[model samples]
Target: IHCFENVTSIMFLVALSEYDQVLENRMEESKALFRTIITYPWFQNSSVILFLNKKDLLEEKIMYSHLVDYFPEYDGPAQAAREFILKMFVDLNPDSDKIIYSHFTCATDTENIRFVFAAVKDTILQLNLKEYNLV
Candidate 1:
């Protein structure tokens, strides 16, 4: 379970519409996992990316579910909810030097997925080059 030998990166996929206890619990778990990974000397060089998925559900759910109910400080303009959720992950690693790139995603939408993949590709390439000083 401590195989960080050749690992260069890590990615996390989370549902954007997850506002319930399960979601909250998973976020806590992820935060702990991220902390453990980043703090491990062998994984210190790994790049991190977070894909916030299920935007379609989030949009629909937001109509009925208010985020502020779960996170009182969430003063929203709905669309910004994705960023708010991303912050949850970022806040976990406030001391990390690595940047956690995040993107909003909808798994059921082809175009949205295509765009997400393209951007993710760009990020990976850029991060790799930068890591090797080839940029």
Candidate 2:
């Protein structure tokens, strides 16, 4: 099942709510694994699209759950918290040359998916072009 063989892109779907996500550092666990993946030679040049999922639930969840409880350095509201998390994952890249594109998503709206997919499609297309000297 050599699944990763020609893979050009990866989607990191991270949950935003604290209810089940932040209780035991599942969020941190994903990050640890992501750090491992991004450094692998096979994945280094790949397009990385991060979906901070459950964005629909985040604002209200942030009202009571408090991101500071776990990520103690954070002091802002939901908006900043989301960006902070995005930064956290993006920083996991051991390679300073590659870029990680990110989106705030609930994945329920058709237009949203259409827009995001377009960027995603373009990203991989460009990567393929460069890899094969077609660009």
Candidate 3:
């Protein structure tokens, strides 16, 4: 469904606060999806931006429903769980030299979306602009 032929950047968006009983743990699926997206050769040359979405929900949810409850091996405080997951993704990167350009974001917040997309546009545009001799 995604065409990557002309793509210069990839925004890997994953929901951090999805706690549906259906997948047992949505984080597991998101991590797997992250692996697939990160390693796929089609986008290997692209600038990968990781948007760990639903931060406001994650902030509230972490106090009660814990990451240790699901990812039991992580016994640290919920605050560090965010960094742990981010680092986990970093470790899974097929190419480690380039920066991942990761961010924690709230989907419903206008300021977050505006700022992220503006910077994200720059990331995507500059790469292609450099390629096309337009910047």
**Using lDDT as the measure, which candidate wins?**
2
Rank the models by TM-score, top first: 2, 3, 1
Q: Any runs in candidate 3 off by more than 4 Å, and if so which?
A: 1-6, 107-135
Regions of candidate 2 where Cα sits further than 4 Å from its true position: 3-5, 18-23, 111-135
Candidate lDDT scores, in order, read 0.69, 0.71, 0.69
Pairs that collide, model 1 = none
Q: What is the TM-score of each candidate against the true structure?
A: 0.63, 0.67, 0.64
Q: Tens digits of per-residue lDDT for model 3 on 33-132?
A: 7777657766566467878877667678877877766776665635477777777667777566556787887664577747877878888999877788
Model 1 score (lDDT): 0.69
- The segments of candidate 1 whose C-alpha lies over 4 angstroms from its true place after superposition are 21-34, 107-135
**Model 2 lDDT per residue over 1-135, tens place:** 655566667775676664336547777777788777767777766576767777777778777777776676665535787777877777777666677778876655458646877878899999987889535
Candidate ordering by lDDT (highest first): 2, 3, 1
Worst 10 residues of 1 by lDDT: 23-32
lDDT of 2: 0.71
Weakest 10 consecutive residues of candidate 2 by summed lDDT: 14-23
Per-residue lDDT for 77-122 in model 1, tens only? 4677777777766777655577667777666457764787787889
